[PDB]
């Protein structure tokens, strides 16, 4: 058999996803999530499909950027593996945990 070493495929994936623009979370699951949360604020609602899309574009850009800062925080601690403590530090400094 052939078997790539740890990190090689991951590095390949980074190059591939940093190259494309397509949404990375599947539509339906996401759509279900949006409606579930919305139901807690007002019942029997409908959504323009463009509204769910706007929310997905916004949420992914947000997670991707947070991921970027999370990576910087892990590297700051001389690691190359992101952990919960890294996301937390990034969010607190961002004022999201103010």
């Amino acid at each position: 058999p052939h078997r790539y070493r740890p990190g090689t495929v991951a590095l390949r994936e980074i190059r591939r996803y940093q190259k494309s623009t397509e949404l990375l979370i599947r539509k339906l699951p996401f759509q279900r999530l949006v409606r579930e949360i919305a139901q807690d604020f007002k019942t029997d609602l409908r959504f323009q499909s463009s509204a769910v899309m706007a929310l997905q574009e916004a949420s992914e850009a947000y997670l991707v950027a947070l991921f970027e800062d999370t990576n910087l925080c892990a590297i700051h601690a001389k690691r190359v593996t992101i952990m919960p403590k890294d996301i937390q530090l990034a969010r607190r400094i961002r004022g999201e945990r103010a």
């Binding site: 190059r15 940093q18 190259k19 494309s20 623009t21 706007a54 574009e57 850009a61 990576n71 190359v80």
Partner: protein, 104 residues
């Protein structure tokens, strides 16, 4: 048209109208819509120029969202002006922290 007298492609009259209907002030001078229209046009020209180049660099003739993102993030000034803005379907700039590269 007022845009003609000003030598602009952007709608001076529309800008005037939007300024009044925007409740920005009780009154709006005649030159404000012209000045504003010109600024809007210049900023538009600036981004289309860089995005067009981005398209040419990708062997493509039609500007798509990705090209606008590339034009903005690669330009120091535009990136700053649009620092808290998300360009839908724009993706991100290729970038990998050096420490994650395979140890040569």
């Amino acid at each position: 048209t007022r845009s003609s007298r000003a030598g602009l492609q952007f709608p001076v009259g529309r800008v005037h109208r939007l300024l009044r209907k925007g409740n920005y002030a009780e009154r709006v001078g005649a030159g404000a819509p012209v000045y504003l229209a010109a600024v809007l046009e210049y900023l538009t020209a600036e981004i289309l120029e860089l995005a067009g180049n981005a398209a040419r660099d990708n062997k493509k003739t039609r500007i798509i969202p990705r090209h606008l993102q590339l034009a903005v993030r690669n330009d120091e000034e535009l990136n700053k002006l649009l620092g808290r803005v998300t360009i839908a379907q724009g993706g991100v700039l290729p970038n990998i922290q050096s420490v994650l590269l395979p140890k040569k």
